Every structure is written in C-alpha cells, then in structure tokens.
Design an enzyme around this catalytic site. Structure first.
Site, PDB file in Angstrom:
ATOM      1  N   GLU A   1       5.371   7.529   4.551  1.00  0.00           N
ATOM      2  CA  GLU A   1       4.669   7.067   3.282  1.00  0.00           C
ATOM      3  C   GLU A   1       3.336   7.647   2.977  1.00  0.00           C
ATOM      4  O   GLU A   1       3.123   7.981   1.669  1.00  0.00           O
ATOM      5  CB  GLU A   1       4.256   5.502   3.507  1.00  0.00           C
ATOM      6  CG  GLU A   1       5.305   4.389   3.386  1.00  0.00           C
ATOM      7  CD  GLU A   1       5.058   3.129   3.929  1.00  0.00           C
ATOM      8  OE1 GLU A   1       4.055   2.700   4.269  1.00  0.00           O
ATOM      9  OE2 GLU A   1       6.230   2.459   4.192  1.00  0.00           O
TER      10      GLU A   1
ATOM     11  N   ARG B   1      -1.550  -4.207  10.406  1.00  0.00           N
ATOM     12  CA  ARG B   1      -0.527  -5.588   9.926  1.00  0.00           C
ATOM     13  C   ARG B   1      -1.223  -6.697  10.550  1.00  0.00           C
ATOM     14  O   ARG B   1      -1.159  -7.637   9.742  1.00  0.00           O
ATOM     15  CB  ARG B   1       0.622  -5.175  11.033  1.00  0.00           C
ATOM     16  CG  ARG B   1       1.312  -3.879  10.708  1.00  0.00           C
ATOM     17  CD  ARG B   1       2.648  -3.861  10.104  1.00  0.00           C
ATOM     18  NE  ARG B   1       3.469  -4.646  11.236  1.00  0.00           N
ATOM     19  CZ  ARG B   1       4.619  -5.050  10.999  1.00  0.00           C
ATOM     20  NH1 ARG B   1       4.997  -5.200   9.966  1.00  0.00           N
ATOM     21  NH2 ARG B   1       5.110  -5.604  12.133  1.00  0.00           N
TER      22      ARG B   1
ATOM     23  N   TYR C   1      14.450   5.680  -2.917  1.00  0.00           N
ATOM     24  CA  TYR C   1      15.029   4.508  -3.484  1.00  0.00           C
ATOM     25  C   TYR C   1      16.446   4.351  -2.997  1.00  0.00           C
ATOM     26  O   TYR C   1      16.910   2.975  -2.836  1.00  0.00           O
ATOM     27  CB  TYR C   1      15.142   4.239  -5.109  1.00  0.00           C
ATOM     28  CG  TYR C   1      16.046   3.107  -5.678  1.00  0.00           C
ATOM     29  CD1 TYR C   1      15.124   1.850  -5.453  1.00  0.00           C
ATOM     30  CD2 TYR C   1      17.182   3.154  -6.135  1.00  0.00           C
ATOM     31  CE1 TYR C   1      15.764   0.544  -5.880  1.00  0.00           C
ATOM     32  CE2 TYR C   1      17.778   2.168  -6.251  1.00  0.00           C
ATOM     33  CZ  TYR C   1      17.264   0.599  -6.461  1.00  0.00           C
ATOM     34  OH  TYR C   1      17.594  -0.416  -6.841  1.00  0.00           O
TER      35      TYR C   1
ATOM     36  N   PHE D   1      10.288  -2.054   0.672  1.00  0.00           N
ATOM     37  CA  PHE D   1       9.075  -1.296  -0.056  1.00  0.00           C
ATOM     38  C   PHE D   1       9.537  -0.415  -0.904  1.00  0.00           C
ATOM     39  O   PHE D   1       9.110  -0.520  -2.291  1.00  0.00           O
ATOM     40  CB  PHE D   1       8.359  -0.669   1.018  1.00  0.00           C
ATOM     41  CG  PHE D   1       6.927  -0.073   0.566  1.00  0.00           C
ATOM     42  CD1 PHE D   1       6.147  -0.769  -0.313  1.00  0.00           C
ATOM     43  CD2 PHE D   1       6.667   1.251   0.487  1.00  0.00           C
ATOM     44  CE1 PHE D   1       5.104  -0.179  -0.780  1.00  0.00           C
ATOM     45  CE2 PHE D   1       5.818   1.979   0.074  1.00  0.00           C
ATOM     46  CZ  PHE D   1       4.732   1.101  -0.804  1.00  0.00           C
TER      47      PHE D   1
ATOM     48  N   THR E   1       3.943 -11.509   5.958  1.00  0.00           N
ATOM     49  CA  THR E   1       3.975 -10.991   4.411  1.00  0.00           C
ATOM     50  C   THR E   1       4.379 -11.980   3.810  1.00  0.00           C
ATOM     51  O   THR E   1       3.795 -11.892   2.331  1.00  0.00           O
ATOM     52  CB  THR E   1       5.529 -10.172   4.666  1.00  0.00           C
ATOM     53  OG1 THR E   1       5.554  -9.104   5.662  1.00  0.00           O
ATOM     54  CG2 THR E   1       6.122  -9.569   3.262  1.00  0.00           C
TER      55      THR E   1
ATOM     56  N   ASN F   1       1.885 -10.550  -3.197  1.00  0.00           N
ATOM     57  CA  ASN F   1       1.174 -10.540  -1.888  1.00  0.00           C
ATOM     58  C   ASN F   1       0.261  -9.733  -1.539  1.00  0.00           C
ATOM     59  O   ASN F   1      -0.123  -9.375  -0.273  1.00  0.00           O
ATOM     60  CB  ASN F   1       2.383 -10.862  -0.700  1.00  0.00           C
ATOM     61  CG  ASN F   1       3.098  -9.466  -0.493  1.00  0.00           C
ATOM     62  OD1 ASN F   1       3.038  -8.660  -1.180  1.00  0.00           O
ATOM     63  ND2 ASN F   1       3.717  -9.394   0.717  1.00  0.00           N
TER      64      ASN F   1
ATOM     65  N   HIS G   1       0.333  -3.814   0.862  1.00  0.00           N
ATOM     66  CA  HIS G   1       1.103  -3.287   1.892  1.00  0.00           C
ATOM     67  C   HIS G   1       0.744  -2.364   2.827  1.00  0.00           C
ATOM     68  O   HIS G   1      -0.436  -1.651   2.332  1.00  0.00           O
ATOM     69  CB  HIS G   1       2.197  -2.460   1.004  1.00  0.00           C
ATOM     70  CG  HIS G   1       3.062  -1.257   1.606  1.00  0.00           C
ATOM     71  ND1 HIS G   1       4.236  -1.695   2.399  1.00  0.00           N
ATOM     72  CD2 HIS G   1       2.900  -0.210   2.096  1.00  0.00           C
ATOM     73  CE1 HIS G   1       4.693  -0.850   3.133  1.00  0.00           C
ATOM     74  NE2 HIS G   1       3.696   0.402   2.912  1.00  0.00           N
TER      75      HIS G   1
ATOM     76  N   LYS H   1      -1.521  -3.846  -3.876  1.00  0.00           N
ATOM     77  CA  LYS H   1      -0.293  -3.539  -5.057  1.00  0.00           C
ATOM     78  C   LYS H   1      -1.142  -4.089  -6.493  1.00  0.00           C
ATOM     79  O   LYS H   1      -2.321  -4.500  -6.373  1.00  0.00           O
ATOM     80  CB  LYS H   1       0.470  -4.961  -4.550  1.00  0.00           C
ATOM     81  CG  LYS H   1       1.278  -4.220  -3.142  1.00  0.00           C
ATOM     82  CD  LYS H   1       2.348  -5.517  -2.824  1.00  0.00           C
ATOM     83  CE  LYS H   1       2.875  -5.237  -1.596  1.00  0.00           C
ATOM     84  NZ  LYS H   1       4.150  -6.171  -1.281  1.00  0.00           N
TER      85      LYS H   1
ATOM     86  N   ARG I   1      -3.750 -11.627   3.448  1.00  0.00           N
ATOM     87  CA  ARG I   1      -2.578 -12.446   2.717  1.00  0.00           C
ATOM     88  C   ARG I   1      -3.107 -14.022   2.727  1.00  0.00           C
ATOM     89  O   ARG I   1      -3.074 -14.822   1.717  1.00  0.00           O
ATOM     90  CB  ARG I   1      -1.258 -12.048   3.104  1.00  0.00           C
ATOM     91  CG  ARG I   1      -0.989 -10.857   2.662  1.00  0.00           C
ATOM     92  CD  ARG I   1       0.338 -10.182   2.692  1.00  0.00           C
ATOM     93  NE  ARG I   1       0.703  -9.574   3.789  1.00  0.00           N
ATOM     94  CZ  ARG I   1       1.319  -8.614   3.864  1.00  0.00           C
ATOM     95  NH1 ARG I   1       1.721  -7.808   2.917  1.00  0.00           N
ATOM     96  NH2 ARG I   1       1.513  -8.098   5.259  1.00  0.00           N
TER      97      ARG I   1
END
Lengths: 148, 148, 148, 148, 148, 148
Positions: free
Chosen positions: C126, C85, C49, C57, C91, C112, C115, C9, C102
């Site tokens: 994705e 993950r 969106y 996300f 998260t 954070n 992703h 990110k 994280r």
C-alpha cells in the site's frame, strides 16, 4: 535561566484543576523544577505577614492555613515570570480573557484559582519561602533543543 | 474562494503538534485543499533567497534545509489569510495571546512553531513555490452549507 | 524500523477529523514519515482492482474516485502495523471499543473513518501504491530518545 | 443571582458543537438552570418581530422557523450576562478572538454559532419568551462553595 | 430510525459533566432529538415504581426527587441503544473500561453519572415517561450524508 | 480510605505528560494526598534493591538515579489500587488498550510512562519509601459528597 513561583489556590485543588493547569505550562514548553502538594502553616504565613499592606498575597496566605492544601510549583524558562502572568490572565476573572486560566476557569476574585509571582524580585522571595534548595531539581529537558 | 499558505516549522514537527494545529483550522470551519510533509531543498530555498532582506521567511527557508521536515498546507475560506494570522498570534510568542497557536505552544521567536502568509500577494507566491497545481485538490465540503 | 499505511477515508475528511487522528498517533509516540491530501484516481484504483475479492480495500478504492479526497499517511515505529490496528478499533464501528478511532467517531461500516494496513506485507504494497520513494522523508525525531 | 439567555443557533446544532459549548460554561463555574432542544415557531417569532429594527435577533428568529432546531439555555451566576458575551466573542467571527466561541468555531456573521443576551433587560425578556417559569430549575450547586 | 433514552444523573450535573457527555455522543455521529434539564417529581417516579423489583431504575427515580435535577436526552441513530450502553461502560464504574463514560468519570455504583435504556423496549417506555411527543424534534442532520 | 502510589517515570516527565496524567485521576474523582517532583537517589534505591528479583520496580529505581526526575504521587479513594492499574493499562504498552495511559502514550516496555502499586501491600511499602508522613496531606474534598 529565569524561574517563577506558581501556586494552585485551595479552590483550584477542590475544583480538580491541578492537571489542566500543569498541562498548559508543559505544552507551552516551560520546564517544571519544583512541585509539591502542601498545607500552608502559621510559620509560613507569619514569615511575611507584616508586609501584607504592600503585598496582598501575604494576606491571602493567612486565609489558606484553615482552608485546604495548595499545589506549589516552580517553573523555569525564558521570560517565564511575565509570560506566566499572561497565561493566568487578569487577577479579577471577570476581566480575564478567554484562553487564560482565570478567564476559562474562574468567576470571582476571591476564588481566582492560581497565584504567580508579579516580578523577578517577588519570584525569588516566594520560591525561598515555599521550597528548600534541595527540593528544586536541576535536570536537562531534551526537548529544549526544539524550544530555544 | 481565498487561500493561504500555512507551514508547521521543523520545531512544530519535532514537538508533535501537527495534529493539534490541523484540528484548530478544521474546527474553525476552514477547508484543507493541499497538505504534504516535505523536506525544504536548496532548489526551493534559492528560488527567492535574493528577496530575504524584504521578506525574512525566505531567509528562514535556508535554515530549514538542514534542520528537519516541515508540514506544508493550503487552506481555503472567506478571509482565511487574515484570520489564520489571528489564530497563529504574534510572531514573537512572548507577545502572542493565550488561545492562539504561538501563545499556547511557543516560547521563542527562533522556534515559533508555524508560518502563515502575511497577505494575499504573499499567499499566491508561497503556494506556487511549495505546491504544483495538481497537488491542490478541488472538492466540495458538504458542511460549508452551515458555515457560509 | 517498521512502517504502516494509514488513510483517512473521505468521510473522515468531510467530518473534519484529520487533526484529531494525526494527534492520536503523535501523542502515542509514532513518527510521521509521509503525508499528503490527494484524490484517488482510476490509475491508482486499477493497479490492484483484480485483487478485490481477496482484499476488499482495493474495492473501496474504486468508490473513492468519485467521492472526495483522502488523507494518506505513512507512520513509523516499533510494532506500528499491529498497534495502529489496535488504535483504529474493529472494522465495524458498532464492534469497536470506546477509546479507539472507530469506537469514538464512527457509526457504520460503510463510513468507518480510516484504513490501515492489516499486515507488514500489505503495508509494503500500500505504501508503494500511494507514495513515491521521494515523498517519504527520512529524519531523526529527537524525542525517540525517550520513547525507545 | 443574575441570569442570561444563551442559544446555540441551528448552525451550532448541525456542526455538532452543543456539548463543547455547554462544557465551556460548566468549566467556567456557571450554573445551568434551564435547557431544551426546541424548534422556533411562528408564535415565538411573532411575539416581538415588530421590534426587529431596534433588536436584530428578533429578525433572526424568523429565519430559524424553517432552518432547524436551536438549543436554548439559561445560565446563572455573578456577572453572567457580560461574562457570557466575553466568552462568545465579537458578533462577527472575523473580529472574535481565538479562545472565544465565535473565535474558535465560526467563520461568517450569518452562521455565528451562538446568541446570548446583550443586557440584563434583554436577558429577562428573552428568558420569558423561551421558558415557562416551571421549566427553570432552582437547585443548589455544591461546588458554588469553592466558586464564590 | 432507532432512539434511546439517556439521562445524566444528579451527580453528573453537580460534577459539571453535561457538556462532556453530550460532546461524546455528538462526535460519535448520533443525532440529538430531545433534551431538557428537569426535576424528577413524585408523579413521574410513581408511574412505574411498582415495577422497581424487576427494573431498579424505577427505584432510583424515587431517590432523584429530593437530590437535584437530571439532564434527560433522546438520541437517534443506527444501533444507538446498544452502542450507547457500550459508550457508558459497565454499570459498576470499577468494572467499566477506561474510554467509557463511567470508566473515565465514575467511582461508585451509587454515583455512576449516567443512565441509558437497556433495550428497545425499555427505551420506548422511558422516552414516553420523560418527553411529550411535541418535545421531540424531527429534523434532518446534513452530516448524516457522511455518517451513513 | 485506600491509598496507592503512582509515579510518572523520567520518560513521562521528559515527554511533558505530568498534567495530562494528573487530570485523568482528577476527572475520575480520586483525591490527591501527596505529590512531589524529585530525584531518585542511591539511598532510596538501595533500601530495597535486594528484593529486585521478586519485585522488578526496585531494579528500575536504580536506573532512575542517573536518568532524570520522577513525579511521585499518592492518590486516595475506594478501590484506588486496582482501579489505577486499570487506568494505566498493561505494563507492555503494545498490549495496553487505547483509553488507558500506556495505551494512549507509550510504545515500549522500557519507556512505559508510569508506575503504580500492584497491591495494597506494595502500596503501603512504596508510599513509606517516597513520602514522610508529614508530606501526606489530610483534607476533605467537598465534591466527595457527589462521588460516594
């Protein structure tokens, strides 16, 4: 292929640097072919103590008999004798460059962490003193395909 | 601000050094403005293969077509072209200092991990070969306030 | 073989963690098959969106348009979706374990770091949003012989 | 035993390098005898500002009053003044070798991470400016038995 | 913003972990607002020794008077008290997870490297015991813009 | 004091993790008392192959005869058998936590980097298979004064 003898001195053992030192040679791409933790004995130290004037390492060996174990290694690769000297840095850690083993970890020449052979000729002799032929492992390292 | 082209060669990819190399330039304070994993194609390699006598990189490009992907990057900062050369070390890893990328990770000149531009002039040319203008990102790095 | 989408990110970019993050996946033994530094655009963010209620996300993507570039990656390997993950941690970084990305690097859920896809189904979607087929490299990683 | 003054400049503080810098001196085998995070004040900076022509550090001190805290340290060991200079690298980070602190972490001479005393004479003076006698701790470091 | 008290115990000092510990909190994104190397005195230890039954730390303080200096720190950030406990791991290092400080570095509960406050209430009290108000630095960390 | 047997499997050798693994046990504070690089032979593997149903390690030993050398180690310290299991992580690396050896470095159960004894009883047996009494070094580690 070329082979050198490298030894973590009792001070490197005591200060817990064995893993860090091995990792540097592994990341460089050299191949580990012999390794043992061991005590230096009078029998090992006497073999060449008469030659201590011309080769001071054979003098230091005597001191190691009573000071703690050493971690002895044989590494293999192209130009490994001279390259390993480069990676160790100058014998006197005050003169060793940051980024080298003595440069990063050592303060005094007395407790300078590591020995490695100074030439091919001394590598052959030192390997023969510390390792029997059957303690050296011959194997192929797959990643050599991307190192050479 | 000044920009250089840096490329992890197929051997650096295969030996899993991409992250370590990027981290060194990030910790130094340089700014990453382009990055992609990619395959070198005949179209890319032919563009300048005629110039391979005067610039041997354009020769190496041909070898990369069949050997594996490369990780191509554009870094930005003050004096980045010459500084990145410093950080990579001598082209021949036997001659490269410990602490440099080739010094720490490479053995042979054939598999010497990384390329970077040798001058501003070659940086401009190499960036133009590997990146379209729209693949270069223009953004402000907040931490530059404490780097410059 | 299985593939996941991972993205550093804008905060991970700004705080100079790209190299460290890539290195963790490289040391784990996963294979990097796509990577680019890029700006998130309205065209990318608008694609999905409408689905932001069920998948947050796609909401965050909108915020990234004006905040800085992201580093987008596709990794391949056995069980990579769920394992990645695990490696990222919870998260909310307050809930993430030390040793995870994280856990080691993040403070707030807003910033954070990273992703990754939550399932195979979201990984396929994705990957298709961020990468064209021709930006994904198919190659064999020799070291897979000792990973699998 | 010999003592030097080392200070992480406000830029090293801001860029989150305090731990990394301390770790390098700890791994080298030097002994930490004074350490504090502190703000440089006009009273500290005025003490020697008249000498700024011959010693530019006393000029920089003035700039630090309004720029952020510094992390001040006193290290002890054999040859620590000159060795710490070696470990920091050249004052201009463009000239500093990879493996040194400025070499690895700095870009410009303005924001060059760290100061250390240039001589024994300046070490004694700088220690006296930043530390009261009672802030220096006298203790024995057991591991010195394997360092000296 | 929330503040916690953290202290490297004499064993962490002796084993040369100060830098590594500080680096973990710096990489996490917390802000260092007080730090000093210091000797625990009878005056400090007596302040709260009467409360040692309900709070065993005030018992340990007495032992530190004769055992070596400690490195005392105040860190600031969102949820820092509980998060720092998470990062330290269980008090008994045998029970601490790998990735935590005690998990990675400690063997016994006697020599368990580090203390941190167990609650906000004990953080306020411990900060007041070890630091005068004027030893705590108030400054803005620019990178907080990407942490919060 | 308690002792466990730990072995880097041929995959950890090939992937160049010996140094990293040793370093983790050294930083934890455990004491290295035996170490050798060696080839597993039919004589070693046959000793206990009849017990492979109840102990699957004695099955894996057979596979190692033709696959590459292993790095065998004996570590000593309080609670070392169970703690070393903790540090290795779950046998299946998909289930192993980040921060553990298998968690950080392994993908599949087939190539899961490392073995360690599951109990004191199996530690005594495995040590006896791989090491002669005279290959185990008895020495005092000075730093134990700050570990225990």
């Amino acid at each position: 292929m070329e082979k050198t003898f490298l030894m973590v001195k009792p001070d490197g053992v005591q200060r817990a640097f064995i893993g860090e030192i091995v990792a540097r040679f592994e990341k460089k791409g050299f191949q580990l072919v012999g390794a043992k933790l061991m005590q230096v004995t009078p029998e090992i130290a006497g073999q060449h103590y008469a030659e201590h004037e011309e080769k001071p390492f054979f003098g230091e060996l005597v001191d190691f008999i009573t000071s703690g174990p050493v971690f002895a290694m044989v590494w293999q690769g192209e130009g490994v004798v001279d390259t390993a000297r480069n990676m160790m840095g100058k014998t006197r850690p005050h003169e060793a460059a940051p980024g080298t083993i003595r440069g990063d970890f050592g303060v005094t020449v007395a407790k300078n962490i590591i020995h490695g052979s100074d030439s091919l000729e001394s590598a052959e002799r030192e390997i023969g003193i510390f390792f029997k032929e059957e303690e050296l492992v011959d194997y192929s390292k797959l990643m050599n395909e991307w190192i050479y």
